[PDB]
Design a protein around this ligand. Sequence first.
Ligand code: SF4
Ligand SMILES: [Zn+2]
Ligand SMILES: [Zn+2]
Lengths: 171, 714
Amino acid sequence: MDDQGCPRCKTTKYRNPSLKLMVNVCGHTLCESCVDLLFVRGAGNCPECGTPLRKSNFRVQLFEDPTVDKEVEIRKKVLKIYNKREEDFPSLREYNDFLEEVEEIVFNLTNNVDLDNTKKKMEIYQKENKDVIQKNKLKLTREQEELEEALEVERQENEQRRLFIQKEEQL
Amino acid sequence: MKLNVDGLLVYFPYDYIYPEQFSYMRELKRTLDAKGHGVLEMPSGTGKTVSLLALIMAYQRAYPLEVTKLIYCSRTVPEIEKVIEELRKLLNFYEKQEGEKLPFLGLALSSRKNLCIHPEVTPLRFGKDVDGKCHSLTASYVRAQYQHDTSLPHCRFYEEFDAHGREVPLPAGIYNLDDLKALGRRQGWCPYFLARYSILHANVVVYSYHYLLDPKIADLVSKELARKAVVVFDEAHNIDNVCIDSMSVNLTRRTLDRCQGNLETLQKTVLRIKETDEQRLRDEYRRLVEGANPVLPDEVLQEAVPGSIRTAEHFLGFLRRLLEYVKWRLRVQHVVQESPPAFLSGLAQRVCIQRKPLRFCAERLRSLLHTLEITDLADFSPLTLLANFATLVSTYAKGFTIIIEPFDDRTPTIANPILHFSCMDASLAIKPVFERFQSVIITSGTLSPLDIYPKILDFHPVTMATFTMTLARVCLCPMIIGRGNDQVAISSKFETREDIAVIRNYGNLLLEMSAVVPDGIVAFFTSYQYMESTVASWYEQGILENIQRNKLLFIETQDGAETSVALEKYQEACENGRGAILLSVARGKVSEGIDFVHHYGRAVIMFGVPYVYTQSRILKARLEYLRDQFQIRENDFLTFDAMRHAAQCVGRAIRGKTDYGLMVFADKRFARGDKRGKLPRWIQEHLTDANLNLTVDEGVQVAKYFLRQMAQPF
Ligand code: SF4
Ligand SMILES: [Zn+2]
Ligand SMILES: [Zn+2]
């Protein structure tokens, strides 16, 4: 919302900040009033670049920095790969070496051509999915579930503490 | 004067000691013999330092192996200067008694800003600026370039110190800060680094808390060398607040914008470095793979690996992501939100920033920023603050909390929101001191009752004794006035604050007390806004003009320059027969910094019990967490915070040399048993039921009579 305005229609960005960026394969600071303008003609084409889009390639995002928008979306996609837990590797260096390669992949995708990254990702898809990728999908789902359970346990304990001290006072 | 203490024989410079001094020395010797941390209170502002220092020196002589050295800390450098003066006098006395020099060293540490000899940094007074300039001059890059001896300003003092002081340490002696500056000038060495090295072999070292509490700078000079040392904190009743401040980090919108600009400059500098010199500075990557100071204490700090951030670009992107998350989280407009662990979890989920890589953020910032050969760290200081916050949050949140304030107090609508990371318990940050050092003595004056302190700070005290000053004459005659001439309650309650009758009672009491009291009087209010309201009411009425006629009136303001000018004029007014009435705030920095002595602040007036506003959400976390853990009632802790502050701001008049003076508290709340009980023992025992709730007129009459009694000689 801190951006000066859209490259084309920098108006709404001044009147109100309600508009949120729209991510695309192009990687852009697109705005809803401008998304309508893209829908009317082209229907999934970047105005200046002209990059084709299958179905408008539009998804909501909330950060004034377009570079952060693209980086966060690319990282979201990448996290689906190389999600194996650290303890799977006993080697000290290998704990974060693969994370280094992951972030290098992210930076490569942000600016440089993604053809090599896609070919490499196909290679990692075939070799790792056989066993480890689906296993770590399961384990990360388990840890998400148990963290939501633990936060609800914390909030049950806080509600019980509030209501029991109220019943202390009234009793 | 050699005192045959029960433990041993202890020298003493002055001729006579009061029985309270005997009690202090015996209790202190008991604690040292037990070799266990403890806390004790002594009334006198001065005299306690000499007794403590003499006992510690004698104990060191008797059992040198038991205690390696003494680490005596004081609130402020102007105060610690008086301590070094006392130590110098004691050493001169002992040296005269022995007839020869002994291998004893005593020194005081202080900031490079306070003491330094470089003309370039001399004109600048801002501490971050001095730190950055000194880092630039002493940089490893500058040292290597000095080896080349190219045409460039190089700070010769550090180089000469490295050449000479490394080989030869200072034999012995006592050096004040000012005298150490002269020694550094004469020897072409650093008064700072020379003392830093002497810490390795020094019998006595004195420096303020922020040199011994904050893990960033405290640890480096408080390394494990002093495994068994007598660490002592003087007048450290406000130790919890400073220990919390050593951890709390405040993030603001302006600071975040400055961080973003600094980060842009960092990126540009990285590009320039890549195009100019790349391989030599890339060797940093190799040493990083092998594996401003960190805020993580000894055991909490970790150095396994930097993490996923292994290159300049990767680290820069990580900081960009975290800064964007903080920016948005702060921009959100809503009620105050608290989230110690939920903040970390939400950060990791929303922006994909794992806590383990986030942990080493500040350390990797230090290393990478060093690689960049920046001009100075002053420009990038906001980024380092944000990095310290980023590493701290990922380090721990069990006894912490992140508070967000989209709207600031005293402003219906302001575009400068603030994110606080205020701590809740000081035990977390003060644990290393207690654990590392065999025994710590928290010697304090005006101490609110000791029982609370073990609860707030997790330690097992050895002795719990309150020492009462005993003199042939009643130096202090405190009183509490709750009933005015109208026989109306004068409590300064929030709902009763607006009461014009109560304000009038305060004004009339001040008028009469200024009429009778001799030159020099200080009145402490509860807040700036309350003080201004009372002053305005008195101005609308004729009371204020009469007070002005009777005696000069000075007022305190938030601005330090005006505060200093007003206090400077107040001192001259006290010296002259005009007199002065200094209105100030209990929480004001002036109240804690200033010390009142004979013919200074003769009658200390306390207008209302000092209570912090019940809306500041930081205190809500700090207080409800104490209720949940350590089991302290909210009202108990609130009244403790009021009584400790009042004792701090009212205990100055009895500084030393047996200078008479009266402490009047114009609030019926102090008459309550709980307030009296929590009041320090020495004041309370002097206080009696006869004068507990004197009317305004009766208090004035008894004050006049007591001043008559104290006027005559011994
Ligand atoms: S190296 Fe020594 S003399 Fe030079 S600026 Fe730093 S403290 Fe001052
Ligand atoms: Zn637009
Ligand atoms: Zn485009």
